[PDB]
Design an enzyme around this catalytic site. Sequence first.
Site, short mmCIF file in Angstrom:
data_model
loop_
_atom_site.label_atom_id
_atom_site.label_comp_id
_atom_site.label_asym_id
_atom_site.label_seq_id
_atom_site.Cartn_x
_atom_site.Cartn_y
_atom_site.Cartn_z
CB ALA A 23 31.16 -10.51 -8.76
N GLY A 24 29.36 -11.52 -6.37
CA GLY A 24 29.27 -12.05 -5.03
C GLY A 24 28.93 -13.50 -4.97
CD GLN A 25 28.26 -17.05 0.02
OE1 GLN A 25 27.71 -18.01 0.56
NE2 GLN A 25 28.68 -15.98 0.70
CB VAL A 29 25.09 -6.05 -9.97
CG1 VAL A 29 24.19 -4.91 -10.59
CG2 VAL A 29 24.46 -6.55 -8.66
CG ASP A 134 22.92 -4.15 4.47
OD1 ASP A 134 23.93 -3.82 5.12
OD2 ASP A 134 22.97 -5.02 3.58
#
Length: 271
Positions: A23-25, A29, A134
């Site tokens: 999870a993220g800003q 997923v 990345d």
Amino acid sequence: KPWWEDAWEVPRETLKLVERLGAGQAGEVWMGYYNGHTKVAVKSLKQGSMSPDAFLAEANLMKQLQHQRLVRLYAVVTQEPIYIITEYMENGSLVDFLKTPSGIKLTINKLLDMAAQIAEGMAFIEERNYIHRDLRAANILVSDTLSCKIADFGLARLIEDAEYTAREGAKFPIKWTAPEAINYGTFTIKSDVWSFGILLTEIVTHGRIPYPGMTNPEVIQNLERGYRMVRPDNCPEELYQLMRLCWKERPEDRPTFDYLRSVLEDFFTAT
């Protein structure tokens, strides 16, 4: 191609989301199923967090980079809420997998094998004129058969000439990024090479943070003196010297990914 002709568009009804993987800003997923039987990963965009066009750009790039060693784009849903559906990698991020009971038990031979798989995927990216930007163990996914694949193409770019220049205030993880990228915002496939050397330290230390005990300013200070990361504990000297090649001062002196792949296969088929 408009969604109605796009071979990749799928009706949202074809998907059933079952468990959150990350999870993220910018979103989440989830592991889910396509048409009831096929396990897939579904990346959802957190509405308002970032432009949908920006979100979707990653899928458009993945269409150009289909290879066994790269997480494969499965489908997209381009009507809000939007999704990018991809290949599912059971064991998640390599940086996390190496800390589990299974990961801890891996021999140096298997770790060398995994490094070679990663270099093989980057060699494909290299030959297609792309860069990833990345490259770290967090962005390498592990399958149920312990094969590795490159993931998260958010920063990935097609290199028209030899270099991509990030814009003024762009910030990147200092410990994994090449000095020319930190200093001038300039990225080339040789910057990814530098990141790969750092990634190798993550593989050999089972996921430890690079440059142990040092802050970002100390890392910069040391690099500018000509020093490189101190030999990790229990790191075969051959691998450490391969890392040093990845960390050559001049980008042009760093090897290619096809060279790294070749060497790591020899290392593996020796151990």
